Amino acid sequence: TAGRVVRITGPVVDVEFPRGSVPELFNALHAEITFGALAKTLTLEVAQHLGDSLVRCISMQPTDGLVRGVEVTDTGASISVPVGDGVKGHVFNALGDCLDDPGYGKDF
Amino acid sequence: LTNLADELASVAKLLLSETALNKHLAEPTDDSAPKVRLLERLLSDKVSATTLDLLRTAVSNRWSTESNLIDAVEHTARLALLKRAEIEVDEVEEQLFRFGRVLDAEPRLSALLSDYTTPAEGRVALLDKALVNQTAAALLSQTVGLLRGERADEAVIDLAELAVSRRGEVVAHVSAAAELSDAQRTRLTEV
Amino acid sequence: XXXXXXXXXXXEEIGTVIDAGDGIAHVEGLPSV
Amino acid sequence: XXXXXXXXXXXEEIGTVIDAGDGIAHVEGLPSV
């Protein structure tokens, strides 16, 4: 199952879910964006509940290139980052992707 | 006419039952093909052909407010039932208006007329037991069933005004110390 | 027949949460508290 | 049956100016924007 998008304005996005499908606070949501020159993967963190199966949330990527009606998938989990001894001597972003190597830090 | 009115009452009750359908059907759209497809896919074989076509025409037509569309069905049912009763108009209208006046006279009954989250048909049974023209009683029961948090005195006043407006005559309230003569009353009507 | 109709008409608590957020929630359904 | 309704609702081009003025405007439909 999944929800849809109703309004877009700035970085805040409100989404809709069917009955018995709203998740809890501090959860990770994924959305797919497509275009000829701007294709990415939006990651969103649930902010608050508006009722009527509507939840308002924030995204950590620019919202340019978006279109209404796109379904949004849910991982049912909060934000997480790998940890370990190999983290030392490496550079990571907010999502924890190794800036030094694209494929680094995806197994711990 | 009676079967069509019953079908319209059923469709109004089911549409009022759920808020999601009412919210979505009111979206201001130039197109209606998905709307008519949804109507066909959702219990379209439980209604007569003429009533279904009227409903489809209503759905196709744009409406400023959803509650306007909802009340349009009730108004259409009321006018259709009134025309069926007409098809004796003066006697029926006088009976209905005097019934409304006599029920408005009692303030205890007006207090008990408040129906919110009350049983759907128990209140109707109580009201009809408390109280005739078959058409008048049927219209009264229809009004009782369709109300939601509204003044029943205003409802019956509006219904009587609509009924008298169906004909070309215009209502007028006359206050006098005592009843006027029949010749006097006819001369007054002529004036 | 009005008072009679009235007498004829005359003849376990829990609520539901509708919305929440920021440490404040809305709940409805309690008659008298 | 509600899911089916939603799915059915989910399924060149011309727009229409709903309201315009003061350098701003509103347009209906055209969900491919």
Q: How many CA atoms lie within 13 A of A48 on its CB side?
A: 10
Q: DSSP characters for B138-168?
A: HHHHHHHHH--S--HHHHHHHHHHHHHHHSS
Contact D13, D30 (CB under 8 A): yes
Q: How many CA atoms lie within 13 A of B126 on its CB side?
A: 21
Residue A45 to residue A87: CA distance in whole angstroms = 25
Q: Which residue of B has its CA nearest to D30?
A: B29
Helix axes B33-41, D2-10, angle to 10 degrees: 160
Q: Cα angle at A26 between A25 and A27, to 5 degrees?
A: 95
Name the nearest CA neighbour of B26 among B61, B74, B52, B50.
B61
Contact C5, B126 (CB under 8 A): yes
Does chain C reach chain B with at least 3 CB pairs under 8 Å?
Answer: yes
Q: Which residue of C has its CA nearest to B123?
A: C9
Q: What is the resolution of this structure in A?
A: 7.3
Q: How far is B179 from chain D (nearest CA, A)?
A: 59
Binary contact (A49, C19; C-beta < 8 A): yes
Name the nearest CA neighbour of B80 among B18, B153, B178, B12.
B12
Q: Strands, DSSP E only, in chain B?
A: none
Q: How far is A54 from chain C (nearest CA, A)?
A: 10
Contact A13, A55 (CB under 8 A): no
Pick from D5, D6, D7 the residue to mutate for testing the B interface (most B CBs within 10 Å). Answer: D5
Q: Which residues contact A12 (CB under 8 A, 6 or more apart)?
A: A47, A56, A57, A58, A59
Query: What is the amino acid identity at position A104?
Result: Y
Containing domain of residue A24, as a range? 1-78
Binary contact (C2, B129; C-beta < 8 A): no
Structural biology method used: cryo-EM
